Design a protein around this ligand. Structure first.
Ligand SMILES: [Cl-]
Length: 231
Protein backbone atom coordinates (compact mmCIF):
# COMPACT_ATOMS: atom_id res chain seq x y z
CA UNK A 1 0.00 0.00 0.00
CA UNK A 2 1.13 3.51 -0.98
CA UNK A 3 -0.16 6.30 1.33
CA UNK A 4 -2.47 9.01 -0.10
CA UNK A 5 -2.22 12.63 0.88
CA UNK A 6 -5.33 14.78 0.91
CA UNK A 7 -5.17 18.55 0.90
CA UNK A 8 -8.11 20.52 2.23
CA UNK A 9 -8.48 24.11 1.02
CA UNK A 10 -8.33 26.97 3.51
CA UNK A 11 -11.52 28.69 4.52
CA UNK A 12 -12.84 32.02 5.69
CA UNK A 13 -15.40 33.06 8.29
CA UNK A 14 -16.82 36.37 9.54
CA UNK A 15 -17.65 37.35 13.12
CA UNK A 16 -21.37 37.04 13.71
CA UNK A 17 -22.03 34.95 10.58
CA UNK A 18 -22.65 31.21 10.25
CA UNK A 19 -19.83 29.06 8.95
CA UNK A 20 -20.29 25.67 7.26
CA UNK A 21 -17.97 23.45 5.26
CA UNK A 22 -17.98 19.81 4.17
CA UNK A 23 -14.92 17.73 5.08
CA UNK A 24 -13.89 14.98 2.60
CA UNK A 25 -13.75 12.14 5.14
CA UNK A 26 -14.30 9.48 2.49
CA UNK A 27 -10.97 10.46 0.92
CA UNK A 28 -9.12 10.61 4.25
CA UNK A 29 -10.50 7.51 5.96
CA UNK A 30 -10.12 4.13 4.35
CA UNK A 31 -13.01 1.85 5.32
CA UNK A 32 -13.36 1.33 9.07
CA UNK A 33 -11.06 4.16 10.18
CA UNK A 34 -11.88 6.65 12.91
CA UNK A 35 -12.02 10.34 12.01
CA UNK A 36 -10.95 13.05 14.46
CA UNK A 37 -11.42 16.77 13.81
CA UNK A 38 -9.69 19.20 16.17
CA UNK A 39 -7.70 22.37 16.49
CA UNK A 40 -4.20 21.44 15.28
CA UNK A 41 -2.11 20.13 18.15
CA UNK A 42 -5.14 19.88 20.50
CA UNK A 43 -7.91 17.37 21.18
CA UNK A 44 -10.75 19.90 21.04
CA UNK A 45 -12.01 22.18 18.32
CA UNK A 46 -11.86 25.94 18.72
CA UNK A 47 -14.76 27.14 20.89
CA UNK A 48 -16.71 28.50 17.90
CA UNK A 49 -16.78 25.25 15.92
CA UNK A 50 -18.71 21.98 15.98
CA UNK A 51 -18.02 18.73 14.08
CA UNK A 52 -20.93 16.61 12.80
CA UNK A 53 -19.39 13.20 12.03
CA UNK A 54 -22.48 11.82 10.31
CA UNK A 55 -23.04 14.69 7.85
CA UNK A 56 -19.28 15.37 7.60
CA UNK A 57 -19.95 19.07 8.32
CA UNK A 58 -17.75 21.45 10.28
CA UNK A 59 -19.93 24.37 11.34
CA UNK A 60 -19.79 27.32 13.65
CA UNK A 61 -20.56 30.93 14.57
CA UNK A 62 -17.53 33.04 15.59
CA UNK A 63 -17.48 35.81 18.17
CA UNK A 64 -15.12 38.82 18.10
CA UNK A 65 -12.79 36.91 20.42
CA UNK A 66 -12.41 34.29 17.66
CA UNK A 67 -10.86 36.71 15.13
CA UNK A 68 -7.73 35.37 13.41
CA UNK A 69 -6.44 32.12 11.93
CA UNK A 70 -7.48 28.70 13.19
CA UNK A 71 -5.58 25.61 12.15
CA UNK A 72 -7.75 22.50 11.99
CA UNK A 73 -6.53 18.90 11.86
CA UNK A 74 -8.52 16.12 10.22
CA UNK A 75 -6.99 12.74 11.06
CA UNK A 76 -7.85 9.08 10.49
CA UNK A 77 -6.88 6.34 12.91
CA UNK A 78 -7.10 2.57 13.00
CA UNK A 79 -8.59 0.97 16.10
CA UNK A 80 -6.14 -1.67 17.28
CA UNK A 81 -7.07 -5.09 18.74
CA UNK A 82 -6.12 -3.58 22.11
CA UNK A 83 -8.34 -0.54 21.67
CA UNK A 84 -5.50 1.83 20.86
CA UNK A 85 -5.95 4.53 18.23
CA UNK A 86 -3.17 4.17 15.70
CA UNK A 87 -2.91 7.39 13.62
CA UNK A 88 -2.81 6.71 9.86
CA UNK A 89 -2.96 10.15 8.27
CA UNK A 90 -3.56 13.82 9.00
CA UNK A 91 -4.66 16.73 6.87
CA UNK A 92 -4.44 20.31 8.19
CA UNK A 93 -6.06 23.45 6.82
CA UNK A 94 -6.83 26.83 8.28
CA UNK A 95 -9.86 29.10 8.66
CA UNK A 96 -9.39 32.85 8.93
CA UNK A 97 -12.07 34.65 10.91
CA UNK A 98 -12.52 38.20 9.74
CA UNK A 99 -14.00 40.95 11.91
CA UNK A 100 -16.76 42.55 9.81
CA UNK A 101 -19.66 41.63 7.57
CA UNK A 102 -20.72 45.26 7.10
CA UNK A 103 -24.37 44.20 7.39
CA UNK A 104 -24.09 42.79 3.86
CA UNK A 105 -25.21 39.20 3.10
CA UNK A 106 -22.51 38.76 0.42
CA UNK A 107 -25.14 45.06 -2.77
CA UNK A 108 -25.96 48.53 -1.37
CA UNK A 109 -24.30 51.52 -3.02
CA UNK A 110 -21.36 52.99 -1.12
CA UNK A 111 -23.50 56.14 -1.00
CA UNK A 112 -26.26 54.25 0.78
CA UNK A 113 -27.05 53.26 4.35
CA UNK A 114 -28.15 49.69 4.90
CA UNK A 115 -31.64 49.19 6.35
CA UNK A 116 -31.32 46.56 9.06
CA UNK A 117 -33.93 44.78 11.18
CA UNK A 118 -32.55 43.84 14.60
CA UNK A 119 -34.05 41.59 17.25
CA UNK A 120 -32.70 41.94 20.79
CA UNK A 121 -32.67 38.68 22.77
CA UNK A 122 -32.10 37.92 26.44
CA UNK A 123 -29.18 35.59 25.77
CA UNK A 124 -25.42 35.35 26.25
CA UNK A 125 -23.65 33.96 23.15
CA UNK A 126 -20.50 33.28 25.20
CA UNK A 127 -22.54 30.80 27.32
CA UNK A 128 -23.87 29.06 24.20
CA UNK A 129 -22.28 26.22 22.26
CA UNK A 130 -21.61 26.61 18.52
CA UNK A 131 -24.52 24.33 17.76
CA UNK A 132 -26.81 26.42 20.02
CA UNK A 133 -25.72 29.58 18.18
CA UNK A 134 -26.51 28.04 14.78
CA UNK A 135 -29.83 26.58 16.04
CA UNK A 136 -30.92 30.03 17.20
CA UNK A 137 -30.27 31.44 13.70
CA UNK A 138 -32.10 28.42 12.20
CA UNK A 139 -35.15 29.11 14.39
CA UNK A 140 -35.32 32.76 13.33
CA UNK A 141 -35.76 31.86 9.63
CA UNK A 142 -39.60 31.52 9.90
CA UNK A 143 -39.77 35.19 10.95
CA UNK A 144 -37.00 36.82 8.94
CA UNK A 145 -37.58 34.93 5.67
CA UNK A 146 -33.80 35.20 5.31
CA UNK A 147 -31.58 32.15 5.06
CA UNK A 148 -29.44 31.13 8.05
CA UNK A 149 -26.20 32.26 6.42
CA UNK A 150 -27.53 35.78 5.76
CA UNK A 151 -28.40 36.69 9.33
CA UNK A 152 -25.96 38.16 11.85
CA UNK A 153 -25.68 37.22 15.54
CA UNK A 154 -23.47 39.15 17.97
CA UNK A 155 -23.39 40.21 21.63
CA UNK A 156 -24.81 43.40 23.06
CA UNK A 157 -22.03 45.84 23.77
CA UNK A 158 -21.83 48.40 26.56
CA UNK A 159 -25.17 47.14 27.82
CA UNK A 160 -27.28 48.99 25.25
CA UNK A 161 -30.64 47.29 24.67
CA UNK A 162 -32.02 49.87 22.25
CA UNK A 163 -31.12 52.01 19.24
CA UNK A 164 -32.34 55.62 19.40
CA UNK A 165 -31.83 56.03 15.62
CA UNK A 166 -34.48 53.36 14.83
CA UNK A 167 -37.49 54.71 12.89
CA UNK A 168 -39.66 51.63 13.60
CA UNK A 169 -39.60 49.40 16.66
CA UNK A 170 -41.65 47.37 19.05
CA UNK A 171 -41.70 45.29 22.15
CA UNK A 172 -41.00 41.67 22.81
CA UNK A 173 -42.22 39.40 25.59
CA UNK A 174 -39.47 39.97 28.15
CA UNK A 175 -40.10 42.10 31.24
CA UNK A 176 -36.63 41.66 32.72
CA UNK A 177 -33.28 41.20 30.98
CA UNK A 178 -31.14 38.77 32.92
CA UNK A 179 -28.24 38.11 30.50
CA UNK A 180 -25.93 40.47 28.66
CA UNK A 181 -28.06 40.20 25.53
CA UNK A 182 -27.67 39.25 21.89
CA UNK A 183 -28.40 41.05 18.66
CA UNK A 184 -29.83 39.01 15.77
CA UNK A 185 -30.14 41.08 12.60
CA UNK A 186 -30.61 41.03 8.84
CA UNK A 187 -30.76 43.37 5.85
CA UNK A 188 -34.11 44.65 4.59
CA UNK A 189 -32.79 46.86 1.82
CA UNK A 190 -30.93 50.07 1.02
CA UNK A 191 -31.84 53.48 2.52
CA UNK A 192 -35.46 52.44 3.14
CA UNK A 193 -37.91 54.46 5.17
CA UNK A 194 -41.14 53.59 6.88
CA UNK A 195 -43.09 53.66 3.62
CA UNK A 196 -40.69 51.39 1.70
CA UNK A 197 -40.01 48.78 4.39
CA UNK A 198 -41.62 45.40 3.64
CA UNK A 199 -44.45 43.93 5.68
CA UNK A 200 -43.01 43.26 9.15
CA UNK A 201 -46.16 42.01 10.92
CA UNK A 202 -44.63 38.53 10.82
CA UNK A 203 -41.89 39.83 13.13
CA UNK A 204 -43.73 42.42 15.25
CA UNK A 205 -46.75 40.30 16.18
CA UNK A 206 -44.99 37.10 17.25
CA UNK A 207 -42.39 39.20 19.07
CA UNK A 208 -45.00 40.94 21.24
CA UNK A 209 -47.24 37.85 21.74
CA UNK A 210 -44.45 35.48 22.85
CA UNK A 211 -44.66 33.18 19.83
CA UNK A 212 -41.25 34.33 18.63
CA UNK A 213 -39.55 33.63 21.98
CA UNK A 214 -41.30 30.22 22.22
CA UNK A 215 -39.80 29.27 18.85
CA UNK A 216 -36.32 30.77 19.35
CA UNK A 217 -35.81 29.44 22.88
CA UNK A 218 -34.85 32.82 24.35
CA UNK A 219 -36.79 35.84 25.59
CA UNK A 220 -37.28 38.61 23.06
CA UNK A 221 -36.53 42.12 24.45
CA UNK A 222 -37.66 44.01 21.34
CA UNK A 223 -37.08 44.64 17.66
CA UNK A 224 -36.14 47.71 15.66
CA UNK A 225 -35.39 48.91 12.15
CA UNK A 226 -32.61 51.40 11.53
CA UNK A 227 -30.35 52.64 8.72
CA UNK A 228 -26.69 51.92 9.30
CA UNK A 229 -23.65 53.74 7.83
CA UNK A 230 -22.08 51.93 4.88
CA UNK A 231 -18.78 50.15 5.61
CL1 LIG B 1 -19.58 43.25 14.94
Amino acid sequence: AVPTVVGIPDGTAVVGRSFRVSIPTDLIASSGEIIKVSAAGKEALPSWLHWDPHSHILEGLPLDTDKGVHYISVSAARLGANGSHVPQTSSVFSIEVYPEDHNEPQACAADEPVTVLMVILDADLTKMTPKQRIDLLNRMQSFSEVELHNMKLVPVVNNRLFDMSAFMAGPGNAKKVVENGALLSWKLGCSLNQNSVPDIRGVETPAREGAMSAQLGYPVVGWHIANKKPT
